[model samples]
Target: KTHVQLSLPVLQVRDVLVRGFGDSVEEVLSEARQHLKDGTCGLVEVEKGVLPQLEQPYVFIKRSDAAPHGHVMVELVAELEGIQYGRSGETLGVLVPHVGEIPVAYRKVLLRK
Candidate 1:
């Protein structure tokens, strides 16, 4: 279980734009591929489509040691949309999207019970 952490401060999702593939996702994928090829770890910033008042700060976590075997975790820390949830409450669980009839736990206590 190796952890590779990278942080970008207060980046707006809509305002951040990527190059080399015409979109932010493509740019990120391209950079990730290049990193895999070069056997290195770092961060890249895409600036061209950033909206000053319509985006939130995001943190992306990558768990990997070397190519093709890693996972990406994205989290929204703060946003222009206002605080979506309280620090401790049902609001936190609502952040996770439901794809089906999945059981929802509002707190760790519920899971432990």
Candidate 2:
């Protein structure tokens, strides 16, 4: 059989901002997972108990693309999740030099590129 090239989806938890408070990393991760099961587009709002300091910290437990493994041509997709501000780019991008060989991190998963 010929090899098929396609993008796979996975879940990732990003906790770079607020550390442990009332909810552990696993707890937030599971909550995001539950959101996916509940059909919430993987958008989960951090509970007040968590007390995220940033501008409305939330999580997206959605599918994301991953690096291809080997010559098998078959990719193992993962369920992923994460959080961020609404318009940090509009704000932060202004301060930092928007020009550079910066890397990209895709947080959303899509079958179609």
Candidate 3:
């Protein structure tokens, strides 16, 4: 059996900033990205009945190297609410509404010393 090492600087949701009676879309995206880069894992709270009715937030993770967990593909389609860090929280990438769910996959690579 082989082992794989993970990297750092994982992204997460910190907060959201809605604007113009919920007419702003770019703001939401910008805020989400900033929060993730800052490593603040939290939902960006938007106003009720906003332009985009967010049913659920989509989270993603990308692998850096090919290892035992690389060739293994898993598709998890289920509601994961109120679960703190149920999945691998360190390698998180993006978080968006259901309509704009980003496709997340792992990539293989080699580490340098």
**Highest-TM-score candidate:** 2
Clashes of 2: 10
Candidate 2 segments whose C-alpha is farther than 4 A from its true place:
1-22, 41-113
> TM-score for every candidate vs. truth?
0.21, 0.25, 0.23
With a 3 Å backbone cut-off (N, CA, C), the pairs that clash in candidate 1 are 15-49, 15-50, 15-51
Score each candidate by Cα lDDT.
0.25, 0.25, 0.30
Models, CA RMSD each: 16.1, 14.7, 13.1
lDDT of 1: 0.25
Candidate 1 or 3, higher TM-score?
A: 3
lDDT of 3 by residue, 28-95 (tens): 43444444345332322223443143333333333333344333221111122433322332332333
Pairs that clash in candidate 2: 10-64, 10-78, 10-79, 10-80, 11-78, 11-79, 11-80, 12-80, 12-81, 63-109
* lDDT at position 83, candidate 2: 38
Output the lDDT of residue 75, model 3: 16
Off by over 4 Å in 1: 1-23, 43-59, 63-113
By lDDT, the best candidate is 3
| Tens digits of lDDT, candidate 1, 1-113 | 23333322222233223312112433434443343234332222324443232223221222212222322333222222353221222111111111122232111111100
